[PDB]
């Protein structure tokens, strides 16, 4: 689905895991109640794609943004067509 | 000695114990009067004992969990009638006509897709 979009997502994931998850000290540790100075808050020149809250979480195969499921990593339709052929262990048609 | 019956009704499961003593009542370490004595379904527990006269001739100790008032009361009643086999099967004959031994299987229906709740359907317009 417009693999140009897919290129944008992979780039963001690369930046996010490169900068953040270890610059988290800049955000949380310092912007705390130490007892201040806005220097740490002022240092937010990061690429702006390093923020983890900018990844859209697309489907692995087709790449559509909507109808995603975390458990399988696929969209609703790709989950369905893979489930009916097997592939996904343990999935059945539920009824009760 | 003591006799037992399980009893179940609408998500509620009970445990009933019968002894041949006075007419004392205790439910889950409390009294029937204190548990649901004067509120809804107060006599439901008494029904299995109003017939085949009680007076003061059976000690009753039970414990229940799951459900709600009415369910738990119904679960108890099923336990009483199922454990009230003390007098062999003779009293079961009139117990059937009362209609207490029959376990009441009336669970809540699931909610289906496209429906608002179970059988309630969303409002519809033609034009």
């Amino acid at each position: 689905a417009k693999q140009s979009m897919k290129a944008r997502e992979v780039k963001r994931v690369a930046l996010a895991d490169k900068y953040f998850a270890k610059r988290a000290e800049l955000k949380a540790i310092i912007s705390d109640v130490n007892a201040r100075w806005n220097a740490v808050l002022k240092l937010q020149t990061l690429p702006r794609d390093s923020s983890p809250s900018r990844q859209r979480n697309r489907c692995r195969q087709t790449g559509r943004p909507h109808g995603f499921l975390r458990k399988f990593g696929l969209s609703r339709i790709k989950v369905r067509e893979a489930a009916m052929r097997g592939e996904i262990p343990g999935l059945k048609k539920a009824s009760w | 000695n003591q006799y037992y019956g399980t009893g179940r009704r609408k998500s509620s499961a009970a445990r009933v114990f019968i002894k041949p003593g006075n007419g004392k009542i205790v439910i889950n370490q409390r009294s029937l009067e204190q548990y649901f004595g004067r509120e809804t379904a107060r006599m439901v527990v008494r029904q299995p004992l109003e017939l085949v006269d009680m007076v003061e001739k059976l000690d009753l100790y039970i414990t229940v969990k799951g459900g709600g008032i009415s369910g738990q009361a119904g679960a108890i009643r099923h336990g009483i009638t199922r454990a009230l086999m003390e007098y062999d099967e003779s009293l079961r004959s009139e117990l059937r006509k009362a209609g207490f031994v029959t376990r009441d299987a009336r669970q809540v229906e699931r909610k289906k897709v496209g429906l608002r709740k179970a059988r309630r359907r969303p409002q519809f317009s033609k034009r």
Binding site: - | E39, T40, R42, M43, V44
Partner: protein, 151 residues
Amino acid sequence: PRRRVIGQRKILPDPKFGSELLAKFVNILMVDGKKSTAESIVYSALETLAQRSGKSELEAFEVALENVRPTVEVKSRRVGGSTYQVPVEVRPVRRNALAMRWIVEAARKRGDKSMALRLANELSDAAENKGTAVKKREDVHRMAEANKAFA
């Protein structure tokens, strides 16, 4: 109803008096599925009725009902290509069911303070043949007499 003639579903008697008839009455008065609230209201109303009219609860209730029970009602036949409103005798079970419904409906529209009072006033003047429920019964009856020509 198209095919199968059906049986009946039973109900538990009144805990106070063990009357199926009164249990149905409270059950008709019930709204939103609150039996405790309903039985509380009726018990308050009937005891007030008893001390008002002496006697006892059951006969006080019976006299209220027998004054509003309808014996005949009108129904739409529509067999001859025309809108005919023919009278038909009412069944016993339906006869009292209509009475209780009319009584509750009349009490609901009264203007007293507490619903318990509203029932007490309605059940009292029902025994005296001047309540709105009694007015409905005679309204239904007179319509049946007007259309007596069809049968």
